[PDB]
Design an enzyme around this catalytic site. Structure first.
Site: not given
Ligand SMILES: *C(=O)/C=C/NCC(=O)CCO
Ligand SMILES: [Cl-]
Ligand SMILES: *C(=O)/C=C/NCC(=O)CCO
Ligand SMILES: [Cl-]
Lengths: 247, 246
Positions: B48, B186-188
């Site tokens: 993300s 921003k997170t990911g």
């Molecule tokens: C942003 O980083 C969104 C992440 N969502 C989780 C995934 O992308 C993996 C499992 O859906």
């Molecule tokens: Cl996220």
């Protein structure tokens, strides 16, 4: 078509603290405003530090403020408040209401350009008499709560007579609370304690971006004691919490 | 330029048994501090965090029509209940609404997406495998140091995009406001992978404090969703001990 209605369900928040004041809350999507007091919502009061919003926009539009990263250097001369004795960014100067920084901006803008912009912005009684650097603190400039929310809606839509870039710079400098579901942009103002028969005024104006809705607000109250000052945010905060907007 | 290893942050990682890196640069990306020189420059799936360049590109190409664009929910099932609603750009960014950004990427298209990631010097610039999932599942990779360089360019309005579009995205990234500072972040999360090939979790952003700015990028191996909170708590505790936030 814009509309306004008088409510009573917010009176308990004022009378509980013995406060004479007004709150105006407008929902952007319905073009509908609500207030506890239609007469006081239309009454014009000294904007005090809320004037720093148009002052910042005019400073950027005239080039007096070069950009969002502009640093306002402290020359080491004594200032009225400890908090102002340091280099400030535009957001820093807005956050602590640094009067001397904005006095200098207003001086470089000049009376002719300041008058032109306050007319283009339809900002209050547009009366800047009494001196170019004090007409908003304790001068003749007056603005109502209804005029404040009209002005802030224009800023939010980038509809003021200024570049979109300059309106975006001021909008980010006004952010005061962030949460995953909402962003609060706001600005406080306080003219002083005045007297018991002629008390000063305290403001809190801004807007809340909540989900896809936007809420414009303007609060003002009579203040004769600096201990009452926290009520300028607690009363409107409690009303917006009861409306489900913030918290 | 330089990256300097700072052993005084290792405690925050080992106390939680986390394998990860924190990169923190004051004023500019010219001098960065990190707990791990090798991992600071190692490239990982952005997940993300890619919504930052994706939002700028969407605005530059006109796919995102303007600042107040509402992304309407068509009512069809989305992978998270918090995505099943109309969203503003800030709303889509703050809840990491993948499907909103998938449709932006499809409309941008592979040719324009490649051109902008080259202009942005965004990691390995590899967008192969599918225009609507390359940053989630395929070969796009970026390091913590490259994230801070990219965020510094955004902070200075030096990306190849209008200043207006960079200002719109910077406001959408505000996550904490205090009188003394403003945090943009921003997170990911790529997913859990396995104990042997773990997924990655990110937290990237910058702090505008008085007249100073601090750029940061955190990533960590993650094989259990229960560990997600550490992606913010570890960097938060390091920046609190540095007197940057809190
Ligand atoms: C942003 O980083 C969104 C992440 N969502 C989780 C995934 O992308 C993996 C499992 O859906
Ligand atoms: Cl996220
Ligand atoms: C703007 O609202 C500035 C306020 N400054 C402080 C006062 O006006 C109080 C004077 O004691
Ligand atoms: Cl104030």
């Amino acid at each position: 078509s814009n509309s306004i209605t008088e409510n009573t369900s917010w009176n308990k928040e004022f009378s509980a603290e013995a406060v004479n004041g007004v709150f105006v809350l407008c929902k952007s999507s319905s073009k509908s405003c609500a207030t506890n007091d239609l007469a006081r919502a239309s009454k014009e009061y000294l904007p005090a530090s809320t004037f720093k919003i148009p002052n910042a926009i005019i400073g950027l539009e005239t080039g007096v403020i070069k950009n969002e990263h502009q640093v306002f250097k402290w020359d080491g001369k004594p200032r009225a408040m400890k908090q102002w004795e340091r280099d400030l960014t535009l957001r820093g100067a807005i956050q602590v209401s640094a009067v001397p920084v904005f006095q200098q901006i207003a001086r470089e803008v000049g009376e002719v350009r300041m008058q032109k912009y306050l007319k283009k912005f339809s900002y209050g009684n547009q009366n800047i008499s009494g001196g170019i650097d004090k007409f908003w603190l304790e001068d003749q400039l007056r603005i109502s709560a209804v005029n404040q929310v009209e002005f802030l809606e224009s800023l939010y839509l980038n509809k003021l007579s200024a570049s979109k870039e300059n309106q975006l710079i001021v909008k980010e400098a006004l952010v005061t609370e962030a949460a995953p579901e909402y962003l609060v942009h706001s600005k406080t103002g306080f003219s002083g304690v005045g007297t018991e028969s002629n008390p000063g005024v305290a403001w809190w104006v801004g807007w809340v971006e909540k989900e896809t809705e936007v809420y414009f607000f303007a609060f003002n109250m009579d203040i004769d004691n600096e201990s009452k000052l926290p009520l300028r945010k607690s009363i409107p905060t409690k009303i917006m919490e009861s409306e489900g907007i913030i918290g």
